[PDB]
Homo-oligomer: 295 residues x 2
């Protein structure tokens, strides 16, 4: 079957007929500017379509839900349509991804493989509120952004929640990274959004660490393999985009190992992230600590 | 209007006709044993009703959902009906209660005023899963329990989620306090349940700290007042139970200042948070609320 994300993206592309032209504009901007991490800034989305810019210029247009939905979606799909990476977390790893080492640097989240990735965490049974209603979080997109605040561009990681519903709120939730501070400092000093983000970072960390457990159709994908540069027509400048999503498993091998322990039935000590230091010119390391089997 | 918790409790008391007798048995047990914190242990609920005990003895009775629900509800309501304390958190404070310090002792959660309290956190917009469905957490009960694990008694705080739904899962989620350890240790080191509980602890802390903001119908209720001994008919041994809930506000005064600052702004507000610290040998703990401040 077609993934519900792809079906909703296609339906949006039909219902907003200018979407493909907007994606073409975004590509042009990216080729012009060549940003270090993002594909196209959320800030520039109003400029992409003149009718949307006009409606957005009306009083209350900057707080309209439908218009921000379309703009957020243009930003999201414009970055994501170039790779269509879907990463499904193994349930045994879901139940063990709970937190990050509190001293974790924001810089580590600059290590994502693409401009935008989709992460499937449905087994985590996390919910949220598109206000007025509680909904199951099927997954989320992580997508880079460039935000100019008081004269300076800032590296931001935006999170877009996917509840697989018609009225899904696609508005991104930002998480600043352009500082030498830690996750706790950005998140915990400076909140609904922050709480949500703080829950999603342990899952996203798999696409940032040096030693992940990523497989494609059962074959291991190394970190070098994941980062291996993709090949934009060099004589035409056009973008080539996938016709189907690329669906990976994260932590399947690990899960498989855990599933063997449970089959035996004397106890399992679950895995977790583990992080530490490396006085001056210090460094960070985070590695997964696998579940171990005792007695 | 009648609070939904009370309506569901009455409907349960009607649908399970032996409930009141079971509550009387619990009272007798309490008077015999006089535990330090709990009213009646979850462990003894199968013994309360013979038909339920018989169905519980069947293969798969132990894991049956309906039975477990009845037992859970007897345990919950038997303690809670003696006080009917409902504590509603103020919107401005709910929003600033996010976590505790990891160092926070488990012992501090022995400071609750009743055997069982209900906390209304509707505005926190927290959700959960009665499996297959996502639901809004309207509130939760915190209720003490006493559990023998491997031959020894243990002090436990149980959490019961309230989603205000017919098929609500009333099964308690335990949290051990007998250790002398900290929240982070008991929880994180040792999880779905643990995660939920971790989220709930910041709200429950208001009923444990030395300087809370609790008001009843606009009147301050001090910690000494809250903790004052209640009056069991001394000649008869009967329990007297409230006919209506006692509804308190937590953080209403605090919220009012915060509202005030917003009014002026309509300059910034630094939000409040819990703040904790130490007090080398024979050390002690302190937690206090840090209020929101107005800047510029």
């Amino acid at each position: 079957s077609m993934h519900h994300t792809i079906a909703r993206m296609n339906a949006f592309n039909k219902a907003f007929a200018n979407a493909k032209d907007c994606y073409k504009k975004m590509q042009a901007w990216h080729l012009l500017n060549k940003p270090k991490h993002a594909f196209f800034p959320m800030q520039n989305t109003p400029a992409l379509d003149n009718g949307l810019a006009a409606l957005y210029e009306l009083r209350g247009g900057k707080e309209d839900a439908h218009i921000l939905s379309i703009l957020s979606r243009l930003y999201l799909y414009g970055a994501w349509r170039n790779t269509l990476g879907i990463y499904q977390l193994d349930e045994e790893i879901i139940k063990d991804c709970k937190e990050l080492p509190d001293d974790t640097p924001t810089s580590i989240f600059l290590n994502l493989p693409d401009w935008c990735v989709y992460v499937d965490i449905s087994s985590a049974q996390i919910a949220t509120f598109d206000d007025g209603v509680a909904k199951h979080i099927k997954g989320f997109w992580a997508i880079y952004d460039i935000v100019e605040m008081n004269g300076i561009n800032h590296d931001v990681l935006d999170f877009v929640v996917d509840t697989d519903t018609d009225d899904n709120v696609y508005v991104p939730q930002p998480f600043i990274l352009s500082s030498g501070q830690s996750v706790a400092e950005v998140l915990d000093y400076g909140d609904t959004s922050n709480t949500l983000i703080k829950g999603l970072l342990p899952y996203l960390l798999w696409l940032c660490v040096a030693e992940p457990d990523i497989t494609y159709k059962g074959l291991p994908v190394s970190r070098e393999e994941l980062t291996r540069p993709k090949h934009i027509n060099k004589k035409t400048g056009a973008f080539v985009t996938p016709s189907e999503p690329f669906i990976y498993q994260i932590g399947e091998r690990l899960g498989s190992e855990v599933r063997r322990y449970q089959s035996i039935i004397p106890h399992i000590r679950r895995g977790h992230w583990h992080g530490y230091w490396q006085g001056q010119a210090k460094e960070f390391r985070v590695r997964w600590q696998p579940a171990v089997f005792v007695n």
